[PDB]
Structure 1
């Protein structure tokens, strides 16, 4: 069909993928529609050990956006392999799962990447290098091409499935990091993770998030996502799963003009639980409006424009 796109590890019936941290492991939104409509799902970050996350308040509203400071709350590798992914496998055996992998040091990332491909339904790993590294002073793996390339290369060695890297946008120049990550063996990229914002309470004069700083997302960041997706697409040959503020089939198509191959939708699910099926059934009419063949073609036409 028109909406189908084929990526490393991913034979997607269409390009819509709920973004990590915005869909749990699918168990909640599944009460609202048949998850088989989706192309895939980036499930919540998996860390080696369980994590409660940060203290509350964890989220805040901004203009056309929100802030989150969840802190990677997740039940850990053992529980995710035993409960959460098998649950997806039973109810949706043919629905490819993208396993977001986060960590605090290189060994932890590698340990997760060794085991988590064993899940039959996990077709891809999305390395979330947008975390603090304690083996480096809380610096993010996603800001140093050398460390990031180390991390990917180490993780590339143990993984039974293709490895995508999820780029942080909080950089001066993003091009060295993508070049480095592609040369370390990444099969694909996802971008972007969140920007950094703060809100203050007028009454208490303290930050509204306990964590002070939090990740900014929503339509407010779509221009930043488009710019960095366009920037990286001129510099790497591995395909890009674009995300950042997508709310419409129009937004999806614009991600394609930037060079994305599939589109992840994250914050928008909170406003409209049906936004991901809504967009999918709305995509063909919008593609006709702008004279587009198939998404597989568009990827090639845009790639050759470029």
Structure 2
């Protein structure tokens, strides 16, 4: 009942891991492939392998999580080699997603050029919102810089491309971003990356709980669902139909998934909840969403996709 069409491709269900979670190594990726996830995405990569920030850099919270990973990854070549080898096997229903988060525009352009030149037939996700890179301002909050980068990207990148965006909190910003994005042959927008630079404190120790950036880190989980849903919905009503949406943020139960789909998301990514539960979460959440649909008499996501009602 969850069969989904996205980026002109067929997926068994809309669920995927969120980049950054359970996708660092080939072993992680293989575990996602073996799981019930409809699709999966690689850890955002940089040209060079990165160790990331000092530990502790991730902490589970009652209402979600806080992290300042620092883009730890095994390097662009590592992930490209994996997806290219995996592609030849045809042992998977649906293309693999490849995330890139260059440390500079030049780095992103370089990686996109390599992807374009390679035989990669999957989907690419350009991360314009990493809030845990020491000394690096979320690009998607700089509308001028974002438009400039995308214009250069589309002068040569012809393969499926989506952008991972930070959350917006003002309607005028959604209007501005939508206007910018609508001029490009983008495949999708993925809302949202973590609510940036939040803080969690241990009152007993009177200290922060993560080492990097004096304790400031990206917030995920239940804390951000209202923001995530709003971003998915705001873009759904502003983006041209050619640009689909991936909903990310606060997805833990079938109900959370249902809500994102009602807003207009086509694919759904799970970060914090997957980090805590492991790949078994996909089978659980799929069944929860199916139960919700059965109760409502729905046999397809199309029966409610984007049908959120206003009062």
TM-score, normalization by structure 2 = 0.85
The answer to whether the aligner puts 1:291 opposite 2:297 as a matched pair is yes
Pairwise mapping of residues 18-167 of structure 1 onto structure 2 (< 5 A)?
18-24=17-23, 25=25, 27-28=27-28, 30-31=30-31, 34-35=34-35, 37-82=36-81, 84-86=82-84, 88-89=86-87, 90=89, 92-117=91-116, 123-131=122-130, 138-167=136-165
Deviations 1:124-182 (A, max 9, x none): 11111013799xx7332110222111222222233242111111015545311233123
Q: Distance in 2 between matches of 1:48 and 1:28?
A: 20
In structure 2, what is the equivalent of residue 187 of structure 1? 187
Q: Distance in 1 between matches of 2:65 and 2:78?
A: 29
The CA deviation at 1:303 is 8.6
- Number of aligned residue pairs: 300
Equivalent residues of 1:63, 1:220 under 8 A apart: no
Q: Distance in 1 between matches of 2:128 and 2:230?
A: 20
The CA deviation at 1:213 is 1.2
SS at the partner of 2:208? coil
Q: Distance in 2 between matches of 1:10 and 1:93?
A: 12
Deviations 1:238-278 (A, max 9, x none): 21110101112221111111111121112111222211122
CA RMSD of aligned residues (A): 2.9
The CA deviation at 1:290 is 2.0
Change (3 A) 1:57 1:42: same
Change (3 A) 1:29 1:41: closer
Q: Which moved more, 1:174-183 or 1:218-227?
A: 174-183
**Structure 1 gaps, min length 5:** none
Equivalent residues of 1:133, 1:141 under 8 A apart: no
The CA deviation at 1:198 is 1.3
**Structure 2 gaps, min length 5:** none
The CA deviation at 1:99 is 1.0
